[PDB]
């Protein structure tokens, strides 16, 4: 099964100038917890924004160019990415925008964080048909001393 995980600000913004302007440690804890010990698939731009391999996870990067780092696995197509994961229960697709768009039709599950933030961005989460998805978990949090915005963890499963 293929899953997508993402953090969306208002108007499905997910990034700006190859970075994420907000800082939500609670959300990054949620990301870690839901990805650890699973393969993660990402695009090249997202690899360059993270800046390092994510520990405890098989890092798989999509790029039409040859790899420039043997600490991670490089692939050249969507099908090859999926094959490189092997026989695992859950593949996590961690973006960015162009990668998300390609894996959304294959995905059975979405892990979305909705952040109450107004941010100008250049990258959006793909527009998905709400009828196709059933919310099976929701958890709202108010802002606190560590998290400057209110946010909502949501898990959706394809109907
Ligand atoms: N808020 C969130 O949840 C997340 C936000 N982001 C943000 O998204 C932005 C980056 O997203 P985006 O600009 O769309 O870039 P992507 O991360 O989606 O990566 C795009 C690159 O990945 C390669 N690629 C994608 N698909 C293929 C394919 N089928 N075959 C071969 N190569 C492929 C290409 O590399 P190449 O050009 O070398 O061929 C392409 O240029 C950043 O700002 C990041 O911070 C990222 C993840 C999560
Ligand atoms: N919900 C969600 N939030 C995000 O911030 C996110 C996402 N999903 N999907 C992809 C993505 C891409 N960018 C990044 C950037 C940094 C880390 C990172 O440093 N993660 C550490 C966090 C450790 C912690 O704070 O607990 C990790 O080990 O996963 C991960 C993904 N970011
Ligand atoms: Mn197999
Ligand atoms: Mn806010």
Swiss-Prot record:
The strain K12 sequence is shown. It catalyses: (6S)-5,6,7,8-tetrahydrofolate + NADP(+) = 7,8-dihydrofolate + NADPH + H(+). It holds the Pfam family DHFR_1. Residues 1-158 form the DHFR domain. Changing residue 92 to F: No effect. Increases catalytic rate about 7-fold. Changing residue 152 to S: Increases catalytic rate 1.5-fold. Increases catalytic rate about 7-fold. Its EC number is 1.5.1.3. GO terms for cellular component: cytosol. GO terms for molecular function: dihydrofolate reductase activity; dihydrofolic acid binding; folic acid binding; methotrexate binding; NADP binding; NADP+ binding; NADPH binding. Pathway: Cofactor biosynthesis; tetrahydrofolate biosynthesis; 5,6,7,8-tetrahydrofolate from 7,8-dihydrofolate: step 1/1. Keywords: Antibiotic resistance, Methotrexate resistance, NADP, One-carbon metabolism, Oxidoreductase, Trimethoprim resistance. It comes from the Bacteria. NADP(+) binds at residues 7, 13-19, 45-46, 63-64, 76, 95-102. Key enzyme in folate metabolism. Catalyzes an essential reaction for de novo glycine and purine synthesis, and for DNA precursor synthesis. Belongs to the dihydrofolate reductase family. Substrate binds at residues 5, 27, 52, 57, 113. Signal peptide: none annotated. This is Dihydrofolate reductase. GO terms for biological process: 10-formyltetrahydrofolate biosynthetic process; dihydrofolate metabolic process; folic acid biosynthetic process; folic acid metabolic process; one-carbon metabolic process; response to antibiotic; response to methotrexate; response to xenobiotic stimulus. The gene is folA.
């Amino acid at each position: 099964m293929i899953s997508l995980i993402a953090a969306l600000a208002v108007d499905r913004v997910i990034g700006m100038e190859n970075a994420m302007p907000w800082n939500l440690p609670a959300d990054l804890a949620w990301f870690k917890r839901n990805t650890l010990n699973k393969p993660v698939i990402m695009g090249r731009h997202t690899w360059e924004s993270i800046g390092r391999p994510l520990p405890g996870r098989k890092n798989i990067i999509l790029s039409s160019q040859p790899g420039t780092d043997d600490r991670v696995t490089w692939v050249k197509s969507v099908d090859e990415a999926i094959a490189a994961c092997g026989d695992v229960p859950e593949i996590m697709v961690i973006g960015g925008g162009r990668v998300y768009e390609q894996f959304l039709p294959k995905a059975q599950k979405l892990y979305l964080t909705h952040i109450d933030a107004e941010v100008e961005g250049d990258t959006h989460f793909p527009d998905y048909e709400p009828d196709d998805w059933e919310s099976v978990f929701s958890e709202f949090h108010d802002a606190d001393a560590q998290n400057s915005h209110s946010y909502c963890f949501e898990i959706l499963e394809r109907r």
